[PDB]
Amino acid sequence: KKNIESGVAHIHSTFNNTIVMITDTHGNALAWSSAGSLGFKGSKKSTPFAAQMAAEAATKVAMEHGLKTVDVTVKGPGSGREAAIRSLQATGLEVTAIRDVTPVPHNGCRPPKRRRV
């Protein structure tokens, strides 16, 4: 439907999870996934393999509506950010841009206590 054939992948990868949503060239979302929505639990949600299969479960649906063009904007200073890409290309999509979008404050707000573990 809508035979968009263009869009941009958003990767949001923290220390203990990983989300990949694929939306079109502007806003409105088409298909998403995350490691939790694949039965994984707890620790394992941060290994790259989780990002592998989540990228797959998103692509497989995004190209069930016609899609080649995609870019990659990676938030999320975590680990599996590149495994997400390697699964994004090698199951059909047409990656052509990588960019980093990490919020960097110019010293505005105060962060929480340091943990004494």
Place this chain on the structure above:
RNA sequence: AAACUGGGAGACUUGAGUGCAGAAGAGGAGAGUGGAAUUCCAUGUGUAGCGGUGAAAUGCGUAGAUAUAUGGAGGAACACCA
């Protein structure tokens, strides 16, 4: 008695200040202003999780969360320079 310390009348320019000619600086007080980010709000797309740990649970979520796009509101601190 008259070297030294004290007192009295003077004299001097090296200490101390003044004039003239220049230099650097997150020194202080007042009044405006900028962008990055966090929170909340409004609206579109959007399906079942998100968040968190050494592992879990409490918490938020099908009164449509998280994500994602555009617009507003307020406060505090000023990345690189260093």
